[PDB]
Subunit: 146 residues, 3 copies
C-alpha cells in the first residue's frame, strides 16, 4: 500500500466509493420491497402476485443513480490508480481524490434525495474535474514513454 | 503473476468472470436474433422490418443479468486485485475468490434460467460477502498507511 | 509507466477510451437539453415544465452507446493492464490495443451516427477479438502459476 505516497489516500477514497455503491444497491432492494416493484415475475410471485412485476419511479431513480455511479466511479478507479504511480505532489493528489469523493457522495444524496436542480448536475461536474485532470496527466506520461 | 501468493488465483477467477460476462453478451445477441427484438431501427430493417425494433422480456432479462454483473463483478476486479497485494492468508484469499466465482456463476444461471425466488437473491448475497470483507480489509490497510 | 514495455501503449489507448466515454456523456447531456428530454422531474421543471420529463429516442441511443462502452471498455481496462505485465511481444501488444481502440471509436461513430447495419456490429466484434485473446492469455498464465 506504500508503493507510492498517494496510494493510501487513493485506496481509502476508492474503497469508500465502492461501499457507497453497495449502499445504493441495498437501498434499491429496499425500495423494491417497500413499493412492491420487482423486475422479474419470479420475484413478484414470491412477494404478493404477478401484479407486482412492475416499474416504479423511485426504483427507476435508484437505478439511475447506480448507473451514473458506474459511468463515473469505475473510470476513477482506473485513472486514480494509475495516477497514484505517476509521482504527483501528494497534497495535489489528495485534493483530486477528496474532490471526487465529496462530489460523488453529494451526487448520490442529491439524486436519491430529489434535491432541486442544478444541485445534482453541479456535483457531477465538480467530481468530473479531477477525473479529467488525471486523464490528461496520464495521457502525457503515457505518450512521452512511447 | 507471482508478485503475491494470492494473485494467480485472483487472476484466474477474475478472467473467468470476464469471460462469463462475454457469454452473457453472446446470449443476449442470440436472443435478439431469435425473438426478432432489436434496439435500433437500423438493425430491425436488416432483420425483417421496422416492426422488429421492439422490446422483448427475454432480451430485457439478459440485459438485467449483464447489468447486475457490471454492478458486482467490476468492483470485485478492483477490490480483489488490491486485496491480493495486502498479504492475506492464501487459503483465506482463495476462499474469498471461489465464493465470489461460484456465487456469480450461479447468479447468472438463476437469472437466465428463471429459477424460483429466492435462489438468485441468495446467490447475489453470497457473492457480495467476500466483496464486503475485502473492502473492509482494504479500508483498514489504507487508513493505517495515511 | 515503464514497468513493462507494453504499458505506455496500454495506458495511452485506455485513457483515450475513457475520454471517449466522457465525450459520450457530454453528448448525452447536450441531446437531453436540445430535445428537452430529462429523466427526472426536478430537471424538467428547471428546463420548461413537467412535460419535459420524458424519454427521447436519441437520448436512449446515447445511453445504449454508453452502456455498450461500459460492457466492453471496462473489461479491457482490466485485461489490458494485466496483459501488459505478462511479457507479450510489444508489437503484438500494440496491435491488440490499437485494434481495440479503433474498433471502439468506430463503434461509437456507427452507433451515434446511425450507420447502416452491420457496421456497428462488425466494429463491436472486431474490438472484442483482442479482448478474447488477452483473456485467454491471462487464463493460461494464471493457471500455470497456481
Ligand atoms: C449513500 C446513500 C445516500 C442516501 C441519501 C438518501 C437521501 C434521502 O433523502 C430523503 O429523500 C426523500 C426523497 O427521496 C425526501 O422525501 C426526504 O425528506 C429526504 O430526506
Ligand atoms: C476540463 C478539465 C481540465 C483539467 C485540467 O487538468 C490539468 O491539465 C494540465 C494541462 O494538460 C496539466 O498540466 C495538469 O496536470 C492537469 O491538472
Ligand atoms: C454463463 C451463462 C449461463 C447460461 C445459463 C442459461 C440457463 C438456461 O436455462 C434454461 O432457461 C430456460 C428459461 O430461460 C428454461 O426454459 C430451460 O429449461 C432452462 O434449462
Ligand atoms: C457485511 C460483510 C462482513 C464482512 C466481514 O469481513 C471481515 O471484517 C473484519 C472486521 O473488519 C476483518 O477483520 C476481516 O478481515 C474481514 O474478513
Ligand atoms: C466519440 C464521439 C463520436 C461522435 C460521433 C457522432 C456522429 C454523428 O454523425 C451524425 O449523426 C447524425 C445521426 O445521428 C446524422 O444525421 C449526421 O449526418 C451524422 O453526421
Ligand atoms: C475467439 C477469440 C480468439 C482469440 C485467440 O487468442 C489466442 O489464443 C491462443 C490459444 O489460446 C493463444 O495462444 C494466443 O496467445 C491468443 O492470441
Ligand atoms: N448518462 C448521463 C450522462 C450525463 C450525466 O452524467 N449527467 C449528470 C449531470 S445532469 C447526471 O447526474 N445524470 C443523471 C443520470 O445519469 O441519470 C445522463 O443520461 O444524464
Ligand atoms: N440493481 C439491483 C440492486 C440490488 C441487487 O443487485 N439485487 C440482486 C438480488 S435480488 C439482483 O439479482 N437483482 C436483479 C437485477 O439487478 O436485475 C436491483 O435492481 O435489484
Ligand atoms: N448488451 C448488448 C450485447 C451484445 C452486443 O454488445 N452487441 C453489439 C453488436 S450488435 C452492440 O453494438 N449492441 C448494441 C447495444 O448494446 O446497445 C446488446 O443488447 O446488444
Amino acid at each position: 500500500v506504500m508503493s507510492s505516497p498517494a496510494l493510501p489516500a487513493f485506496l481509502l477514497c476508492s474503497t469508500l466509493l465502492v461501499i457507497k455503491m453497495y449502499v445504493v444497491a441495498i437501498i434499491t432492494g429496499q425500495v423494491r420491497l417497500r413499493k412492491k416493484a420487482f423486475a422479474n415475475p419470479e420475484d413478484a410471485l414470491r412477494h404478493g402476485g404477478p401484479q407486482y412485476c412492475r416499474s416504479d419511479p423511485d426504483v427507476e431513480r435508484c437505478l439511475r443513480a447506480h448507473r451514473n455511479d458506474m459511468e463515473t466511479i469505475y473510470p476513477f478507479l482506473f485513472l486514480g490508480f494509475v495516477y497514484s504511480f505517476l509521482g504527483p505532489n501528494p497534497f495535489v493528489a489528495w485534493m483530486h481524490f477528496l474532490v471526487f469523493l465529496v462530489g460523488r457522495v453529494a451526487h448520490t444524496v442529491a439524486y436519491l434525495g430529489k434535491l432541486r436542480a442544478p444541485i445534482r448536475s453541479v456535483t457531477y461536474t465538480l467530481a468530473q474535474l479531477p477525473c479529467a485532470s488525471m486523464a490528461l496527466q496520464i495521457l502525457w506520461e503515457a505518450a512521452r514513454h512511447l
